[PDB]
Amino acid sequence: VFYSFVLVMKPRQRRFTSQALREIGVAVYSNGGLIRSITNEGIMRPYSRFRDADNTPLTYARYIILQLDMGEEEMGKVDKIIREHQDVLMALKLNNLERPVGIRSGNKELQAAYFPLDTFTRLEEEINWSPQTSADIYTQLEMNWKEFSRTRWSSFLRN
């Protein structure tokens, strides 16, 4: 992934959030960029209540992961569009996607010994792992799991 954003948005109506995401995608595509992915993560209750433009503390918020491939000047344009949006309370810019964290400030001998195509070609869920994600889930995809998981409920149906 070239760039990723975690958009925290106000839980408005469906049409307002749809228009906000549509304007964000239009600003991405008009500057000559590509959307790798956009995923909605539902409404969760954060540990800190963000304030909107009219200084109202919001208890709930919607999280959206946005993975993009854009040029850096155009990414600055889209970031200035996103950070000045009325519905976006907070959005961090994941700029450590091509190079992993700890290489630049870590060991000096282990600085040019990495491969950027290892991290650039995979998605953001394969770089920053979720708690439900693990290596055995990745090995299950290449092991022909359809012919093996058909017998996993043969003991629980009778009890």
Partner: protein
């Protein structure tokens, strides 16, 4: 009249010591005489922001909170 943000938080944070629904006084009620106007970031607890427990200048020289 201006500056509501300067005495208040950027984002409402809730400490673990005040859980749940942290006790916040009403902003219309004024504080005590000669008291200290501390921002809502560098406060130890919201009970310390009560107008009767608002620390003054002479209490600041003796007690920290």
């Amino acid at each position: 009249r201006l500056d509501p943000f300067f005495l208040d938080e950027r984002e409402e944070t809730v400490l673990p010591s005040e859980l749940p629904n942290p006790p916040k006084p009403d902003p219309s009620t004024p504080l005590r005489e000669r008291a200290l106007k501390v921002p809502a970031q560098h406060r130890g607890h919201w009970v310390l922001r009560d107008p009767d427990i608002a620390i003054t200048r002479e209490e600041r020289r003796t007690d920290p909170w």
